[PDB]
Amino acid sequence: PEIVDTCSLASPASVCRTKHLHLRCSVDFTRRTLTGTAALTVQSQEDNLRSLVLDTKDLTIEKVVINGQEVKYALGERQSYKGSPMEISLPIALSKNQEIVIEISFETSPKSSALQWLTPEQTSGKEHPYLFSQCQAIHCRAILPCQDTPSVKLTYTAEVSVPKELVALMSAIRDGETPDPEDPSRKIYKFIQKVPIPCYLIALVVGALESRQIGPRTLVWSEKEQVEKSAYEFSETESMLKIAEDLGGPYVWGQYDLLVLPPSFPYGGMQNPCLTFVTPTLLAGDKSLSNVIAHEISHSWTGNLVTNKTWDHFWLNEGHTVYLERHICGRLFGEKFRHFNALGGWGELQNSVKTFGETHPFTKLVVDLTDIDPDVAYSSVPYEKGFALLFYLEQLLGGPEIFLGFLKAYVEKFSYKSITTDDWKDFLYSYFKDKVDVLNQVDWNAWLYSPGLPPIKPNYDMTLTNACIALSQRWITAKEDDLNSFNATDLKDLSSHQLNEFLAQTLQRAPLPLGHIKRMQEVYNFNAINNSEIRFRWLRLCIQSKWEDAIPLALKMATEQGRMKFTRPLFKDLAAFDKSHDQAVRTYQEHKASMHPVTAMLVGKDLKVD
Ligand SMILES: [Yb+3]
Numbered sequence: 346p347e348i349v350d351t352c353s354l355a356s357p358a359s360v361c362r363t364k365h366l367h368l369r370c371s372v373d374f375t376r377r378t379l380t381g382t383a384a385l386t387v388q389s390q391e392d393n394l395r396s397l398v399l400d401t402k403d404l405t406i407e408k409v410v411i412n413g414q415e416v417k418y419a420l421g422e423r424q425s426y427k428g429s430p431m432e433i434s435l436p437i438a439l440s441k442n443q444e445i446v447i448e449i450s451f452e453t454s455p456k457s458s459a460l461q462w463l464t465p466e467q468t469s470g471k472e473h474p475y476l477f478s479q480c481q482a483i484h485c486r487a488i489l490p491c492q493d494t495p496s497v498k499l500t501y502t503a504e505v506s507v508p509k510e511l512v513a514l515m516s517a518i519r520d521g522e523t524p525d526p527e528d529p530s531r532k533i534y535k536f537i538q539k540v541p542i543p544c545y546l547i548a549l550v551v552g553a554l555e556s557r558q559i560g561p562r563t564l565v566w567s568e569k570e571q572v573e574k575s576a577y578e579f580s581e582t583e584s585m586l587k588i589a590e591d592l593g594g595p596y597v598w599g600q601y602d603l604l605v606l607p608p609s610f611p612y613g614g615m616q617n618p619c620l621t622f623v624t625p626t627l628l629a630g631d632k633s634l635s636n637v638i639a640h641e642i643s644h645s646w647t648g649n650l651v652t653n654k655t656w657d658h659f660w661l662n663e664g665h666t667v668y669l670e671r672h673i674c675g676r677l678f679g680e681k682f683r684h685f686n687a688l689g690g691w692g693e694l695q696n697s698v699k700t701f702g703e704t705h706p707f708t709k710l711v712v713d714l715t716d717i718d719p720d721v722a723y724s725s726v727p728y729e730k731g732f733a734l735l736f737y738l739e740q741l742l743g744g745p746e747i748f749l750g751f752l753k754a755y756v757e758k759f760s761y762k763s764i765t766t767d768d769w770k771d772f773l774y775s776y777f778k779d780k781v782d783v784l785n786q787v788d789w790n791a792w793l794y795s796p797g798l799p800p801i802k803p804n805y806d807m808t809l810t811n812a813c814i815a816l817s818q819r820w821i822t823a824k825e826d827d828l829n830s831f832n833a834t835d836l837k838d839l840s841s842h843q844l845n846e847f848l849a850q851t852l853q854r855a856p857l858p859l860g861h862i863k864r865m866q867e868v869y870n871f872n873a874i875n876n877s878e879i880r881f882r883w884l885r886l887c888i889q890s891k892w893e894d895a896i897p898l899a900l901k902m903a904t905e906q907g908r909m910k911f912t913r914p915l916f917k918d919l920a921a922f923d924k925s926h927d928q929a930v931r932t933y934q935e936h937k938a939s940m941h942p943v944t945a946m947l948v949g950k951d952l953k954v955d
């Protein structure tokens with residue numbers, strides 16, 4: 346039973362396993378480099394082990410020390426996005442289970458795909474620079490040498506030297522700060538992560554950060570101009586943690602802090618232990634985009650405790666998290682709301698499948714990432730087709746209470762481990778042994794390995810969705826002489842979530858006549874809404890409907906923030922519209938150097954530049 350991580354070039358967990366990382370580095374904003382030592386405590390899993398391989402990507406290695414002496418190592422040739430393998434020759438052959446510590450002196454490249462360095466002008470304060478990391482899926486190797494596979498979990502401690510006036514934070518518990526003995530103009534911040542974690546959860550942020558407490562175990566962090574708004578936006582955080590604990594078991598990470606990043610953060614959120622990273626585009630002003638916090642909170646169980654063994658099994662991480670996420674929202678706002686969000690999710694799955702094509706490999710729940718950059722394959726499929734499967738199993742097996750019992754047992758069963766889809770399925774069959782006849786009715790091969798929409802769509806309560814579909818259909822079937830019928834009162838009884846779903850429904854049938862779009866702005870004044878999800882869909886609707894007035898608005902949103910979910914589709918819509926094509930390409934070219942490296946790369950591919 347052998348499964349290898351095709352995205353890693355390091356020795357596999359069957360050969361050796363990293364148990365701990367002690368990181369000592371200094372952040373050099375002048376050179377845009379992280380410099381230090383990564384001391385890995387490694388345990389041999391084999392007899393007579395004399396060498397091992399680590400993943401690296403654009404790292405400059407100065408030396409490798411074991412037992413106080415330098416040893417031979419060699420960097421192989423780069424393998425595109427996978428980076429360069431680093432083979433280290435051990436001074437003494439190791440016995441099985443023997444542990445040694447290997448200290449590697451390294452320096453990162455300013456072009457590290459794991460990092461984004463921001464000048465003072467790119468921050469809210471305008472006086473200090475800012476640095477932030479994002480390692481998922483395989484960018485940790487672009488920060489430090491390591492076995493960059495989620496099949497290996499390690500604890501870590503770190504000491505980070507940063508300019509005196511800045512603050513460093515990591516996905517660990519803060520363990521103090523002090524002046525830097527070898528440079529009085531610096532501070533050394535210490536950190537400790539006692540719970541084993543896959544390396545993609547290692548995180549670092551350095552900047553002029555301030556904090557505010559918003560719950561018994563939660564501090565919100567951001568630059569000063571965002572603290573008050575963030576504290577209010579995420580005030581439901583503690584109640585969500587409490588519901589999540591009831592669903593998945595105890596929260597074992599100690600603290601649950603939030604860090605609101607600069608606009609270029611590529612994701613809505615990233616589940617870094619002890620410190621969730623979130624996009625500032627969540628600051629809608631009314632806590633309406635809080636499902637993203639519910640999502641990152643859920644990862645503290647599904648993803649961080651029970652982890653996908655390789656990225657081919659990413660749906661395990663995301664499907665279960667979306668499932669727990671929607672239950673948190675269900676508890677907080679009602680079962681009908683969980684169904685509304687669930688049905689919306691199906692809508693997003695439809696969109697993804699239509700975008701890649703119904704036979705495209707990336708629409709499969711379990712994908713083969715051999716030779717595929719995880720960033721290119723990344724989409725809503727593992728999230729929504731994964732959720733769809735669990736939702737279908739829930740309805741098949743007896744309801745939410747029964748399936749939630751399986752999810753808690755699942756987490757408990759695989760805590761602190763890395764598993765595959767087969768491990769999950771075996772446990773599902775084990776847990777529901779008395780309902781195998783029912784389980785044996787699901788078309789596993791289609792659900793897990795076939796492209797396109799799932800072979801079966803679950804049942805969804807339609808209560809909250811009905812008004813959205815009805816208003817969307819009125820607009821789609823409307824002819825010119827019906828436009829006068831629409832009025833701002835149409836939106837009277839719609840929540841922001843329904844307004845968003847109304848636009849999502851309409852966007853699925855875009856383009857609409859340009860005259861309908863102008864009328865929509867005239868009566869609903871969508872241009873005034875700053876809720877990013879609604880503005881995002883409204884602008885795509887305008888652009889795909891060929892409304893030139895929307896060009897500057899779409900360009901502005903595409904560049905002023907960098908959440909991939911919004912930036913990529915906007916640039917793509919703008920490129921597809923002939924009136925804006927040249928300007929979209931030109932705007933990308935000009936912003937490219939100061940964008941997040943992964944986002945820059947993906948928009949480059951989307952627009953077919955270079
Ligand atoms: Yb008519």
Ligand SMILES: [Zn+2]
Binds near residue numbers: 662
């Ligand atoms: Zn997630």
